[PDB]
Amino acid sequence: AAASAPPAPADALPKGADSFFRTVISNMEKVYLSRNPTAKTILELVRSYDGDHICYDHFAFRTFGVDGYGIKSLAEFFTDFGYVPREELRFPAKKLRALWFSPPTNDGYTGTGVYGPLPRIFISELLVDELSPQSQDIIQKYIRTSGKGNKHATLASTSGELTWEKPIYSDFQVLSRESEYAAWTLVNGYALNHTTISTHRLISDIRSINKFNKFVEDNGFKLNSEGGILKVSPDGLLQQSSTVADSALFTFADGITESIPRSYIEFAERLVLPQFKDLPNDEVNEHHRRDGFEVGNADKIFESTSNDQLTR
Ligand SMILES: O=C(O)CCCC(=O)C(=O)O
Ligand code: NI
């Protein structure tokens, strides 16, 4: 038989870097919770129902793929803190590309949320050069107003700031008609687009995602309907659901106040891999479960912020 070996575990961070990294993602989460009452409420409801067991499966971010404002503007922060780039996903109809990142080894975490197992990171970018000339010019205008803001995307994310000037409503309107993703990013920037609860790490009966979905719906919240409320990967091992994004009033730079999408929250179940079929269920750890993401699922979860879902 050919020589075989297990995968090399990723390096762990030194103690200061690990601590510091967690204060940063904690600040990203603070902005997110302050602007997304639905996500904040659901996280409180799960904690009360299940106990202190909430783990974050992944964080997701959106970006403009032009002039260095894209995936790389955030990825460098995470790779400075030991994250490893993984698979690239393509979304041709929506004109998006995404990369996900797996965390450094962190087996000694002592808490939950950002103090629990470190989350994967999912970062997408809009392929701006594929849009109409008019939208390319609108995006380029804001990118010019931002200067070297792209070199400090994490500062922007931790503080809840846009690096470009505040948009005028007319520009938001034009982008909304061609790319809802572009419109989302114009008004939200590098803000955390969602966190994800790892349901299989819960202890109570809502650890099953079908039970979890009914728990959310019975507390009055609406799940993303597109492609069904439960997106199931073709191998059956990655099952995902998400809320409809919250909305907020935004005063645009020309004085007009209008509704915009903020963020949402996702729930994900990763099932055991087939080679570990007969593992006793008390023996399953995260590395025994389906890792990564699935283009089919992701394509429909992007629509949690779409106007059709928000106006259902
Ligand atoms: O809406 C976004 O920005 C990311 C949607 C994709 C995703 O997070 C997943 O596949 O779980
Ligand atoms: Ni997600």
Residue numbers in the entry: 3 to 314
Pull text from the paper:
In this step, 2OA is converted to D-2-hydroxyglutarate (2HG) in a reaction catalyzed by the Fe(II)-dependent DUF1338 family enzyme hydroxyglutarate synthase (HglS). Homologs of this enzyme are broadly distributed across multiple domains of life, including nearly every sequenced plant genome. Conversion of 2OA directly to D-2HG requires two discrete chemical steps, a decarboxylation and hydroxylation, making the chemical mechanism of the enzyme puzzling. We further show that despite very low sequence identity, plant homologs also catalyze the conversion of 2OA to 2HG and adopt the same structural fold as the bacterial enzyme, suggesting that DUF1338 family proteins catalyze the last unknown step of plant lysine catabolism.
Soluble variants of plant proteins were constructed by removing the predicted N-terminal localization peptide. As expected, the E. coli homolog YdcJ and the plant homologs AT1G07040 and FLO7 catalyzed the conversion of 2OA to that was confirmed by in vitro assays analyzed using high resolution LC-MS. In addition, the FLO7 homolog displayed kinetic parameters similar to HglS, with a Km of 0.55 mM and a Vmax of 0.89 mM/min/µM enzyme. In addition, the structural conservation between bacterial and eukaryotic DUF1338 proteins was compared by obtaining a crystal structure of FLO7. The FLO7 crystal structure, like the other DUF1338 proteins, displayed the conserved central VOC fold containing the active site and metal-binding center. Comparison of the HglS and FLO7 structures revealed that orientation of the metal-coordinating residues and 2OA in both structures were nearly identical even though the proteins display low (~15%) sequence identity. In addition, the FLO7 structure also contains a substrate-binding arginine, Arg64, located in nearly the same position as Arg74 of HglS.
